[PDB]
């Protein structure tokens, strides 16, 4: 067992028992306790008592504040250094770089960031030894997906952050039921530290532990490990959220024949009581959570939310593409959320919700840019930097990507099948981003192969810059993007597969004065209606060089007589000639030797159709 007394950590367990853990879970826990040297080990049970007590503890320490206007809601303000851009510090380790990213023809890859095993071991050894001294190591057993779903996967996160424990309780299914379900099965090992052992070597800013200089978020898919150091925030610390959900899961999906994607899942029911599930991939700032929670303007239509951010999808034996939301909550952007843009989110977030980096009103409510509602005379605002703040100051009151973290079970339009273990059958997949010019409101891909190309060719506005963001997965590919494209294409050769219809949307086209041509939000229900009929086989499309678009009079524009359908659906030869050239250069450089034949063929075909305009 040991010749001395430093290997068995049983004496330091303050909740639970090392003896009751599955064998490999114990090894993971105790091995990392030996390395990181926590004071205590707390095996989380996921109970309400655990949660409430931990929140009250963070409140007493000043790590969070209670938002007294609402029911059991809380506010955390971070060190502003811990929400800087850290993609340069997000890496995947594999034996061969080409398995992680394609080797580009001319430039640096924008499709991921590889780190060698050797460089990672050095980075690891310079960070983790002793990193939890004086702190509790929490052990978070969690399921990504409904417990017992054939599509669910289990993780164990070790963390020294109570904020992570509380947020993981919301965003995943956490606690004793998961350990019991796991037994001696496989799981993803998730190791997290804020990187600030006690006694603190550097000043603590805003009661928010982090280590920006050593921040590193690493994924080791061939070891089934996620190892994250130095950040307490978001996808860097809630290791289910992106690390597991997309980066590790996309690699597992490649190995196992399924898909892990940055997609909402919604259910839409028409006035004839027919319901279809749709998935949609848009980048950050492009409105997945607005769509997923849409309040439709068209009478007799209903939208319900399965998930707002991650989809895990697998063709079943019957050929249906079955999707689950592997999350348990919504980790939504707060700024821009209003009664106009997302009324269902406004309803959801007034109880049991943790907010990070938003402003606080003097009566204990929340505030942010784009909230689009006034404060009673008297009510004052504290910014996310803990300073008094007034409407006409230059600095925003909330961080621009500040977040709410809310239980999915509270959404008033949560779908009745949102945690069905079998998943929901996807009939359409939608791509899109911000395109101020050139790209119509909606078009439909001509085939599966064309649809994969449409995903691959996605671009979005960041002077303005238009960047590529294929499949809305640019930050998140777990492996070589060319091999991901081949994996998508391979779905067409699968037995019985019912390949969903693929569409591309653009909510963001602008006129010459910079005004949005389309009102969007709940009005996007009109576009969903057209997609719905297309899936049913309706003769509602006209062929163009980029795909099918709605026929004249096919789109329901009742209540929107002022919309300029001609500018909104216009397709210019000049624009599209440039577009195809841009996509060609991008795919050649960035995908290079790993570009599938079928994607190059779709590029050639689009070029040719544009040439005949
Ligand atoms: N004009 C217009 N803007 C929209 C529409 N839907 C959403 N937005 C804008 O999209 C932004 C919100 O998108 P985010 O919450 O960042 O997008 P997301 O896809 O949920 O992002 P993540 O949560 O980071 O994955 C705000 O600027 C909204 O005003 C629309 O239909 N029209
Ligand atoms: Mn979102
Ligand atoms: Mn996201
Ligand atoms: Na703080």
Count CB neighbours of 391 within 10 A. Answer: 9
Is residue 148 a known part of a binding site?
A: no
For ligand 1, whether the C-beta of 520 sits within 6 Å is yes
Is residue 401 a known part of a binding site?
A: yes
Quote the ligand 3 centre to 249 CA distance (angstroms). 15
Closest CA to 478 of 267, 238, 255: 255
For ligand 1, whether the C-beta of 522 sits within 6 Å is no
Residue 401 CA: nearest ligand 1 atom is 16
Listed in order, the ranges of the chain carrying CATH 2.170.8.10 are 63-85+328-412
Tell me, yes or no, if 411 is annotated catalytic: no
Category of 134 on φ-ψ map: left (φ > 0), alpha (ψ -120 to 50) or beta: left
For ligand 1, whether the C-beta of 289 sits within 6 Å is yes
* DSSP type of residue 222: G
Quote the ligand 2 centre to 276 CA distance (angstroms). 21
Cα 286 to Cα 51: distance, rounded to the nearest angstrom: 33
Is residue 345 a known part of a binding site?
A: no
Nearest residue (by CA) to ligand 1, atom 6, is: 287
Nearest residue (by CA) to ligand 1, atom 19, is: 288
- What Å resolution does this PDB entry report? 1.5
For ligand 1, whether the C-beta of 301 sits within 6 Å is no
Q: Is the Cβ–Cβ distance between 97 and 114 less than 8 Å?
A: yes
Quote the ligand 1 centre to 260 CA distance (angstroms). 21
Closest CA to 282 of 244, 317, 333: 333
Pocket test for ligand 1, best of 83, 295, 305, 333 (most atoms within 8 A of CB): 333
Kind and range of the H or E run holding 603: helix 597-611
Cis status, amide bond into 199, omega within 30 of 0: yes
Which residues does residue 425 pair with via DSSP β-bridges, in sequence order?
322
Cα 324 to Cα 322: distance, rounded to the nearest angstrom: 7
Q: Identify the three-state secondary structure at position 404.
A: strand
Taking the chain, what is the end-to-end CA distance rounded to the nearest angstrom? 77
Is the sign of the CA dihedral 163, 168, 170, 171 positive or negative? Answer: positive
Cα 13 to Cα 127: distance, rounded to the nearest angstrom: 24
Helices (runs of H) and strands (runs of E) counted in the chain: 16, 32
Listed in order, the ranges of the chain carrying CATH 3.90.228.20 are 258-327+413-613
Structure tokens at 546: 């980029």
Which residues does residue 65 pair with via DSSP β-bridges, in sequence order?
75
Q: Which CATH class is domain 258-327+413-613?
A: alpha beta
Which residues does residue 548 pair with via DSSP β-bridges, in sequence order?
444, 543
For ligand 1, whether the C-beta of 261 sits within 6 Å is no
For ligand 1, whether the C-beta of 442 sits within 6 Å is no
Is residue 408 a known part of a binding site?
A: no
Quote the ligand 1 centre to 462 CA distance (angstroms). 13
Structure tokens at 536: 């049913």
Helix axes 481-490, 597-611, angle to 10 degrees: 80
Out of 190, 243, 286, 397, the active site residue is 286
Task: Cite the beta strand spans of 127-263 per DSSP E.
Answer: 136-144, 153-159, 173-174, 188-193, 216-220, 225-229, 259-261
Which CATH superfamily is 63-85+328-412 part of? Phosphoenolpyruvate Carboxykinase, domain 2 (2.170.8.10)
Closest CA to 525 of 342, 303, 307, 345: 303
**Residues within 5 Å of ion ligand 4, judged at the Cβ atom:** 77, 206-208
Please classify residue 374 by burial: count the beta carbons closer than 10 Å to its beta carbon, then call 0-12 exposed, 13-18 middle and 19+ buried: exposed
Is residue 269 a known part of a binding site?
A: no
Task: Cite the beta strand spans of 239-341 per DSSP E.
Answer: 259-261, 264-269, 275-281, 302-307, 311-315, 321-324, 329-333
For ligand 1, whether the C-beta of 338 sits within 6 Å is no
Is the sign of the CA dihedral 417, 420, 422, 423 positive or negative? Answer: positive
CATH code of 9-62+86-257, in short, is: 3.40.449.10
Q: Residue 192, CB half-sphere, CA atoms under 13 Å: how many?
A: 32
**Residues contacting 457, CB < 8 A, separation 6+:** 468, 470, 583, 587
């Amino acid at each position: 067992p040991q010749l001395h007394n430093g290997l068995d950590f049983s004496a330091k367990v303050i909740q639970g028992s090392l003896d009751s853990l599955p064998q490999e879970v114990r090894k993971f826990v105790e091995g990392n306790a030996q390395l990181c040297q926590p004071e205590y080990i707390h095996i989380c049970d996921g109970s309400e008592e655990e949660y409430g007590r931990l929140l009250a503890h963070m409140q007493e320490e000043g790590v969070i504040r209670k938002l007294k206007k609402y029911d059991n809601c809380w506010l955390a303000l971070t060190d502003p250094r811990d929400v800087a851009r850290i993609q340069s510090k997000t890496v995947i380790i594999t034996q061969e770089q080409r398995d992680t990213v394609p080797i580009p023809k001319s430039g640096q890859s924008q499709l991921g960031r590889w780190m060698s095993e050797e460089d990672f071991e050095k980075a690891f050894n310079a960070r983790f030894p002793g990193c939890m001294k004086g702190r509790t190591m929490y052990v978070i057993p969690f399921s990504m997906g409904p417990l017992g779903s054939p599509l669910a996967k289990i993780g164990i996160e070790l963390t020294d952050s109570p904020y992570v424990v509380a947020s993981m309780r919301i965003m995943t299914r956490m606690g004793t039921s998961v350990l019991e379900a796991l037994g001696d099965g496989e799981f993803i090992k998730c190791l997290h530290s804020v990187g600030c052992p006690l006694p603190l070597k550097k000043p603590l800013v805003n009661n928010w532990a982090c280590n920006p200089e050593l921040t590193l978020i690493a994924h080791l898919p061939d070891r089934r490990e996620i190892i994250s150091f130095g950040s307490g925030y978001g996808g860097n610390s809630l290791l289910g959220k992106k690390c597991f959900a997309l980066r590790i899961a996309s690699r597992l999906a490649k190995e196992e024949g399924w898909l892990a994607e940055h997609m909402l899942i919604l259910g839409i029911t028409n006035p004839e009581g027919k319901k279809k599930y749709l998935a949609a991939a848009f980048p950050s700032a492009c409105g997945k959570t607005n769509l997923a929670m849409m309040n439709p303007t068209l009478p007799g239509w209903k939208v319900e939310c399965v998930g707002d951010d991650i989809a895990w999808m697998k063709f079943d034996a019957q050929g249906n593409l079955r999707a689950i939301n592997p999350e348990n909550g919504f980790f939504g952007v707060a700024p821009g959320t209003s009664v106009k843009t997302n009324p269902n989110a406004i309803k959801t977030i007034q109880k049991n919700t943790i907010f990070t980096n938003v402003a606080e009103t003097s009566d204990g409510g929340v505030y942010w840019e784009g909230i689009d509602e006034p404060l009673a005379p008297g009510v004052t605002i504290t910014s996310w930097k803990n300073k008094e703040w007034r409407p006409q100051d230059e600095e925003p009151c909330a961080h621009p990507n500040s977040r709410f973290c809310t239980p999915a079970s509270q959404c008033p339009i949560i779908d009745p099948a949102w945690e069905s273990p079998e998943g929901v059958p996807i009939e359409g997949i939608i791509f899109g981003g911000r395109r101020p010019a050139g790209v119509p409101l909606v078009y439909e891909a001509l085939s599966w192969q064309h649809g994969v190309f449409v995903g691959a060719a996605m671009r979005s506005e960041a002077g303005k810059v238009i960047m590529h963001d294929p499949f809305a997965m640019r930050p998140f590919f777990g492996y070589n993007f060319g091999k991901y494209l081949a994996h998508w294409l391979s779905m067409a050769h699968r037995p019985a597969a019912k390949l969903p219809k693929i569409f591309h949307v653009n909510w963001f086209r602008k006129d010459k004065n910079g005004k949005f041509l389309w009102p969007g939000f709940g009005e996007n229900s009109r576009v969903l209606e057209w997609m719905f009929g297309r899936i049913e086989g309706e003769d509602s499309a006209k062929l163009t060089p980029i795909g099918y678009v709605p026929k004249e009079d096919a789109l329901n524009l009742k209540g929107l007589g002022d919309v300029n359908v001609e500018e909104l659906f216009g397709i210019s030869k000049e624009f599209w000639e440039k577009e195809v050239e841009e996509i060609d250069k991008y795919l050649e450089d960035q995908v290079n030797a790993d570009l599938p034949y079928e994607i190059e063929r779709e590029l050639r075909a689009l070029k040719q159709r544009i040439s005949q305009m």
